[PDB]
């Protein structure tokens with residue numbers, strides 16, 4: 001897609017831990033966190049966080065059941081987030097970056113944040129970081 | 142200040158918990174989290190997070206001892222963050238917003254994220270959210 005407010009949320013697995021990955025669909029910009037468990041509470045909280053930082057209008061996911069819980073629904077309700085029904089793989093890419101930098105850090109969560117840094121700063125010609133900023137700016141002005 | 146890469150980090154206290162507050166100095170844009178303890182590990186991790194999301198060049202604080210630990214120093218080293226020596230109160234403002242919305246949520250951390258949302262979206266004429274995006278965009282282009 002190309003629309004400024006569309007985000008993609010999924011959980012992926014590494015080392016028996018779970019990684020919540022949000023992708024800004026138009027930019028390829030990523031926000032990712034290690035969460036203790038794959039619950040609605042964790043997703044609901046992350047949504048709240050994400051919505052305060054970026055203008056989040058619609059959220060897509062590859063696992064619809066992610067968004068069925070009352071907590072998640074409460075977050076989408078309060079932040080004014082609709083579910084994306086317009087989109088009918090960066091978890092592969094992010095895992096590559098985590099694997100390259102894993103030895104550098106003790107905790108997986110630390111390695112994840114390093115991978116988010118690298119991904120968002122690498123120029124492919126802008127970076128994902130510059131792309132998101134320009135996309136939201138030109139949409140605002 | 143007015144420089145695009147300057148951030149201000151401090152911890153504040155509510156309900157016997159600690160709130161790490163990052164302010165983007167030029168925009169008034171805020172990133173805040175409840176952390177379990179006021180340690181260097183928490184600060185170091187938050188820095189890593191922040192640096193992956195925004196272009197963080199320099200960090201100021203009102204408590205210099207915040208930045209003395211090896212963990213914090215390791216994060217600033219890896220992300221390429223210098224300490225701000227150019228700047229010689231939104232913790233009052235953020236606390237007002239938390240107090241207004243406190244009843245709405247069970248957990249303080251939830252209330253905090255709601256307060257970050259409100260602060261960043263409220264237009265004062267742009268919002269802090271639009272201000273940061275425009276500041277980083279016009280600096281990039």
Ligand SMILES: Cc1ccc(-c2c(C)c(-c3ccc4c(c3)CCCO4)c([C@H](OC(C)(C)C)C(=O)O)c(C)c2NS(C)(=O)=O)cc1C
Pocket residue numbers: 104105106107108110111114181182183185186189211212213215216219
């Ligand atoms: C003397 C000394 C003191 C601290 C560390 C030490 C460091 C530097 C990092 C770290 C920080 C920042 C940082 C990196 C590592 C890797 C590059 C990016 O920034 C971490 C790091 O956890 C954090 C949650 C990010 C703090 C990790 O998960 O590795 C951890 C856990 C350490 N170990 S610790 C706090 O003692 O348990 C090491 C030595 C030799």
Ligand SMILES: Cc1ccc(-c2c(C)c(-c3ccc4c(c3)CCCO4)c([C@H](OC(C)(C)C)C(=O)O)c(C)c2NS(C)(=O)=O)cc1C
Pocket residue numbers: 040041042044045048070071072074075078245246247248249251252255
């Ligand atoms: C049936 C039912 C199910 C869930 C809740 C319930 C809700 C809605 C919220 C919440 C979520 C999202 C949200 C808000 C509240 C307030 C507005 C912003 O979004 C939270 C909320 O914690 C989170 C960490 C954000 C999940 C809080 O700290 O309050 C918590 C802790 C709940 N309670 S719970 C998960 O059972 O322990 C309530 C009812 C009646």
